[PDB]
Symmetry: none
C-alpha cells in the first residue's frame, strides 16, 4: 500500500544507496508516487540504472540515489533488496 | 502478489499465532484467497478479532488462528506482522 520501507537487505543496492527501514519514498526521478507498486515498477523495470529518490525520514525529506541490480532469479528485472512495511 | 510469507515480524500477532516464513495462506475464515491483498484486507479490517487460517507449509495444510492488533501508525486498522520477500 503505502510507499514505506520495511526491512533492507544486507549489502543490497538499497543499503548501499542509504535507504533505511521506515523511510517513505516520496518521489522517483522527480515523479511523485503514492503506491508501493509504483516504486516496485521503477525498481523492476530499470536494472542497472540509478534512481533519484526523495525519502521522508525522521520528519525530513532528503535525496538518495539507489541503483537496482540484476535479480538473481531473473536477471532481466531489477532488484533493490527492500521489503514493504510490515502489515 | 502471492499470499506467501517472505518475512514475519518478531513478537507480532503473526509469529504468536504460529505463522512462519514460507507459509502460504490458503483461506481466511473459510473463504479461499489467492492474493496477498486479500489477506491484507482481512487483517486490516478485523483489528482485535481472531482469523481462522488454513496455511500450506511443506506440502501440508494446517489450521492456525491469528488476531490482528491495532496498527502502530494507525490504531483503527489491524496489523499482523507480515511482508513479502525482498524485491
Amino acid at each position: 500500500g503505502e510507499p514505506s520501507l520495511g526491512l533492507v537487505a544486507k549489502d543490497s543496492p538499497a543499503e548501499k544507496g542509504g535507504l533505511k527501514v521506515g523511510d517513505t519514498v516520496v518521489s522517483v526521478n522527480g515523479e511523485s508516487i503514492s503506491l508501493w507498486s509504483e516504486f516496485v515498477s521503477f525498481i523492476e523495470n530499470n536494472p542497472g540504472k540509478p534512481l533519484e529518490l526523495i525519502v521522508a525520514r525522521d520528519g525530513y525529506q532528503q535525496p538518495l540515489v539507489v541503483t537496482p541490480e540484476a535479480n538473481e532469479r531473473d536477471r532481466t528485472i531489477g532488484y533493490l533488496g527492500i521489503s514493504p512495511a510490515f502489515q
